[PDB]
Design a protein around this ligand. Sequence first.
Ligand SMILES: Cc1cc2nc3c(=O)[nH]c(=O)nc-3n(C[C@H](O)[C@H](O)[C@H](O)COP(=O)(O)O)c2cc1C
Ligand SMILES: Cc1cc2nc3c(=O)[nH]c(=O)nc-3n(C[C@H](O)[C@H](O)[C@H](O)COP(=O)(O)O)c2cc1C
Ligand SMILES: O=C1NC(=O)NC(C(=O)O)N1
Ligand SMILES: O=C1NC(=O)NC(C(=O)O)N1
Lengths: 312, 312
Amino acid sequence: MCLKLNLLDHVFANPFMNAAGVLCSTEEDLRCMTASSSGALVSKSCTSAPRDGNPEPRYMAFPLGSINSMGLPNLGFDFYLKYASDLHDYSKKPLFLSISGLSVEENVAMVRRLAPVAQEKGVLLELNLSCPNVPGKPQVAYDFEAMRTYLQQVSLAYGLPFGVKMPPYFDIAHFDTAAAVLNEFPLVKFVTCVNSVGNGLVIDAESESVVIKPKQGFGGLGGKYILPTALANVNAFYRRCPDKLVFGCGGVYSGEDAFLHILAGASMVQVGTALQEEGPGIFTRLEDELLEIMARKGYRTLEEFRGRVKTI
Amino acid sequence: MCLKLNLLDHVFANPFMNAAGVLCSTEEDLRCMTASSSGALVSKSCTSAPRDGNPEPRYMAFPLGSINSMGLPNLGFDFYLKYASDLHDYSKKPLFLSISGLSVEENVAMVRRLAPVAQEKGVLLELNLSCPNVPGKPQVAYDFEAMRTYLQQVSLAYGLPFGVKMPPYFDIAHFDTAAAVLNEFPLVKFVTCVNSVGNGLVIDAESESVVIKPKQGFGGLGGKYILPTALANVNAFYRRCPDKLVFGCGGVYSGEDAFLHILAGASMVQVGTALQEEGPGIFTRLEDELLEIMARKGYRTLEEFRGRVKTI
Ligand SMILES: Cc1cc2nc3c(=O)[nH]c(=O)nc-3n(C[C@H](O)[C@H](O)[C@H](O)COP(=O)(O)O)c2cc1C
Ligand SMILES: Cc1cc2nc3c(=O)[nH]c(=O)nc-3n(C[C@H](O)[C@H](O)[C@H](O)COP(=O)(O)O)c2cc1C
Ligand SMILES: O=C1NC(=O)NC(C(=O)O)N1
Ligand SMILES: O=C1NC(=O)NC(C(=O)O)N1
C-alpha cells in the first residue's frame, strides 16, 4: 500500500499539500510546511509588490468552516521567487508558487521573471484566477473572456507548464464553458478546484455583527460548508479535461474527505481551513486515515480508485 | 408579544413559511401547510403541464443539509391555479403560488391566467428564475439578459405585483448587476434569496457512489451548508433594493437562524430542508425560539432589528 504519485515530472510521497494562502506566507511558514509530512507545498498567492492586505479581523473559523477576506497579504513576488531560487530544499518535496496579479499585465510581469527559475529549479506555477477578496476586483474566472485573455497572455509570456486555481461554479453551462476555455491551452497541465466560495456572510447572533471587517463582512468560505461544492467542481473538471490533471481543494478534514476528492478525480489534495485550524500535524493524520480506508477496501495505490466515483 | 406583521397588503401571523418545493406539491400537502402554524405558504413551482420530474433517488438529507435534483415534479399549473382560486382558505393565511416555466413563453402563458385569480383572491406570485435541476436548462438569473427578458415579459403579461426566487451569487459584480436588473421592474415587490446552491455533488465513501440518480449525481444544496451564502445574498439584495422586500431562504433550522436572516434584511423567512426533515411541527418551535431570542435582547418588534446587522 502506498500514497506515492509521479506527475508533472515530479515525485510526491503522498497527495497532500497546503492550500495556497494557508501556512505559506513567510520563510518561517514555508520551512514549516517543508518540515511537515505533506507531499508538497504551495506559496502564498503573490503580487508584484508586497501587500498588507485587508483590515483585521479578516479570518474567522467555526465548527463548520471559515470565512476570510485576507486581501492577498504577501511579502511580494521578489521574496517568493528568491525562496524558490535559493532557499527551498527540493530534496524534501516539490514546490508550487502561486501568483495572483491584480491585472493581466501584473501576472505577465511575474511569469516573465519566474520562467528561468522554473526551468532551473522545477518550481511549478499555480495561477490564481479566483481571489474573491480584493475590493473592486471580481473573480477573474467568473468572466470567461477575461479568463481567456489571462491564459493567452500568461501562456505566451511563460512558455512552460502551469496550473490554474479555479473558483467554484454552480451552473452546468459554466462547467462546460470554463473547461472548454482551459482546454484551449496546452500549457495548462493542472486545474485546482476550488478556491473559497466567494462573498458569504457570517453573522454573530449575540453581538448582531458580522465577524470580519473588510467589505462589510463579505468573505470567502472554506471548510465543511463547501465539500459537496468542491467535489462537484473536481469531478466536473475531471470529466471535461481528460488530458489535464485536477487537484482537489475544499472541505478536507479527514482521510475520508480526501478519499472522496480522489474518487471524484483529484490527483493532489490541498488542505486549507483544517490546516489553519489544526496545524501541520494534520498531514500525518490524513495519511494514516487515507491508508486505513484503502486497506479496508483493498486498494493498493491511488490510481486504483482515482476518478472512479460511481453514478446510478 | 407576538410575531404578527403586514406585507404586500396582507397580514401575516409570523414571518415563517415553507420554501417552495417542500411540503406543497399535492392538495394534501397544501392543506397540511395551511393547518400548520406557519405565517404563510407557497405552492410547488409549477409548469404548464404536469411533470413526473427526474428519476429517483432524487433527494437525500444528511446532518449538514440536503442535495436534490427533483426536476420540477408537479401536478401542473391547472391544479395550483384551482387550489388558489377554489380551495385555499385565505382566512387562515396568505398563499404564494410559485411558477417555473422552462421558457419565457411558458411563464407568460401561466401569468396571463393567474392574473384574474390574483385580482379576485389576492394570491401572490413568486416567479422562479433559479431552478438548477432540469437537464439542459441553466439557471435563468445566471444569464442577465435572459433574466431581463423574463421580467419584462412577465411584467407586461401579468401587470400585478410579484416576487422573484433568486439563485445565490458569489461575486460582488453579480450582486450589483442582478439587483440593478431587479430595480428596473417596479412590479417586482419582493426578492427571495436564495434557491438551492446549484450543482453540488455528494459522494458516499462506503459505496463509492453518488447519492442521487439524475445528472450523474449533481444537485442543488440546502441546509447547514448554505447559511452564510444565504445570509450574504439576503443582505446584498437588502442593501441594493431599498424599495423592495427581501424574503430569506437557506439554512434555517432554528429561531436563531431566522433571527440572523431578519438581521440581514429578511421580511419573511422560508424553511426548506429543515421542514422536509422535521415536518410542520417545526413552525411552532421556530416561533417559540425567535420570540425567546427577541425577549432576551429586549426586542418587541421585527422592525426593531430587521436589516440592522452591524458592520465593523
Ligand atoms: C486564510 C486564507 C487565505 C487564503 N489565501 C489564498 C491564496 O493566497 N491563494 C489561493 O489561491 N487561495 C487562498 N485561499 C483559499 C484556499 O486555498 C482554499 O481554496 C479554500 O480555503 C478552500 O479550501 P478549504 O475548504 O480547505 O479551506 C485562502 C484561504 C484562507 C482560509
Ligand atoms: C425537495 C426540494 C424541492 C425544491 N423545490 C423547489 C421549487 O419547486 N421551487 C423553488 O423555488 N425552490 C425549490 N427548492 C429550493 C428551496 O425552496 C430552497 O430555496 C432551498 O432548499 C434552500 O433552503 P433550505 O436551506 O431551507 O433548504 C426545493 C428544495 C428542495 C429541498
Ligand atoms: O485566492 C484567494 N482566496 C482566498 O480565500 N483568500 C485570498 C486572499 O484574500 O488572500 N485569496
Ligand atoms: O427551483 C428549484 N430548486 C430546487 O432546489 N429544486 C427544484 C426542482 O428540481 O424541482 N427547483
